[PDB]
Ligand binder design. Structure first.
Ligand SMILES: [Cl-]
Ligand SMILES: [Cl-]
Ligand SMILES: [Cl-]
Lengths: 243, 243, 243
């Protein structure tokens, strides 16, 4: 079976579930392709009104793998960018992050319209842990959605934060026990789906406008700085020591 | 007696009290006219420094009536906009929302410089409950003042939130028991009124500048989308079922 | 010994400590000159990665003195602006505000990248207490860093807020007991300093860009309004009564 699966929850709410156990929901070729496919299916079914994006087990999304980053130090690969995949979806998305989210994997959820975190799981913008600056419009999205201060500390330190620690810190998203994350998202999705699809699409376009206007330049600027800071002598060794 | 009354609280603090019991402080012709009149009186008295805007009993403001919305589906009336009334006032305003605030009625309070909510009362941007998108620069004002995440959820769902629920959610305004709302506002007003009027007027103009610059386009854009989403076949029936 | 001293904490973290007991860390000529000197020393040592800025005893920074303000009413002096001093530093700064911070002294800390407040100490943007409008891009910086609502109330009232009161209000910075403030800052600094200096400098430039773009006009606009509201008949007497 494909590693990304779409299921119907009723009343126009659907769930896209990532389950690439081999990569722990990393940005593997099969995850990228399965996300593209499932979002294509969503775009084609006019009856769908809300997407719930979620992981499996202990993982929401692990982002780019350390093996991938090592390949990148040799100039073997370029930067993965799944933002267009998520941002192109015209109906509201709730990211039910029932498991850990690291780097690009945290951004993947934060690109969504609503986000739910697990109390027990760990979340990180870990770029600076490896010693280099973010990609993916990290600063734009984190400042908008987590607030400038959490965004600042998470980006500078690159550390792992449990959901509970983020809640205690006043993160402006719900943080609930792992076994309740998906249920919470589903309940919110059903409330949202009470509205006509036309109104949901129109509202989302309106609400998303300001960030969408700023997104391309944000991606470009982060990419440019990333290319300088990633390609420094000591980075390969720093990545090696995180395995 | 007129349904909107102005009283003096001392030291330049004044109270404008809405009491159209027949419409539960809806955007009735008498409320609109009485607000215009009382704000005219304020503009003319140089001794006034702070306005406290409040309701009566269980209601702060009910916004546009369901009867009005039904008339609108027939093209009988156009969209009410009380923003200019509030935003034109040059001295600070505290909205003492001791009662419920629905739709335009919640926005009416949020146009103020300071806002106090009742723990027991209910608050909603209920446009999407009826199935159509907001008016009144709802997204601009809610994102600025409640934060992007509360704003997102309240606008998408259209649901009723008690003050207590909003406080638990980390709303950045004081939320106190209903019997304490007006007193809290009055105490804050007296602190503010310790400053020279010239300085209050100058400061408010400075602080209000960025939102005021964005307001006209926000109103226009919301109006345009509203006209499309309001005029869809199923909306009249949705409004009917909310009586 | 000089009233501002630089010490090394290890791993590239340094501490700049203000101790002008005679002015309670006011914007005295010796504080201004000692801050300039110590930040020059920092700029010249490539091994330094994080600056912790702190006070002594009960005071972080008292900003402009009342004696200074009285001199200003006579047109004896112009407005002090230490923003360029702080904003020019290319490495991250943590303001460990273990003591009180008043007026420009609160802004001095808030210009930093990270800020830690004492539970027991008092904080104020006290301009309006004297009866005149802020300087130093107060509204820009407070709205960005404390949030629009705390910023609004603190600026309008000019009152003294204990750290504890700000924490209860949901301020988005850590607030800890006075005896723990510097330790907390030092611990955060050591986490930050784990990154390569090149990456810290690049990230800070990127993150600071939007505020830096807006800063000059903010300073200019506040200065212009300040000049009008400060030079009103009753201000000298208001300042007199705050001694
Ligand atoms: Cl479904
Ligand atoms: Cl009065
Ligand atoms: Cl050191």
């Amino acid at each position: 079976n494909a590693v990304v699966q779409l299921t119907e929850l009723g009343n126009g709410v659907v769930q896209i579930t990532m389950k690439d156990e081999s990569s722990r929901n990393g940005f593997s070729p099969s995850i990228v392709e399965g996300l593209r496919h499932c979002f294509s299916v969503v775009a084609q079914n006019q009856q769908y009104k809300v997407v719930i994006l979620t992981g499996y087990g202990n993982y929401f999304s692990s982002g780019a793998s350390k093996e991938f980053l090592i390949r990148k130090t040799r100039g073997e690969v370029e930067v993965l960018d799944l933002s267009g995949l998520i941002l192109d979806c015209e109906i509201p998305i709730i990211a039910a992050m029932q498991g850990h989210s690291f780097g690009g994997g945290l951004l993947l959820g934060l690109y969504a319209d609503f986000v739910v975190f697990s109390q027990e799981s760990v979340y990180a913008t870990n770029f600076m842990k490896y010693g280099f600056t973010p990609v993916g419009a990290t600063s734009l999205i984190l400042r908008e959605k987590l607030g400038s201060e959490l965004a600042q500390e998470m980006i500078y330190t690159g550390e792992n934060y449990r959901g509970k620690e983020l809640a205690e810190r006043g993160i402006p998203f719900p943080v609930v026990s792992r076994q309740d994350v998906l249920n919470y998202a589903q309940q919110l999705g059903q409330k949202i789906a009470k509205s006509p699809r036309l109104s949901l699409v129109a509202l989302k376009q309106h609400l998303s406008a300001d960030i969408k206007a700023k997104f391309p330049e944000a991606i470009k600027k982060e990419l440019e700085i990333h290319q300088v800071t990633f390609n420094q002598p000591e980075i390969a060794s720093r990545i090696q020591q995180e395995f």
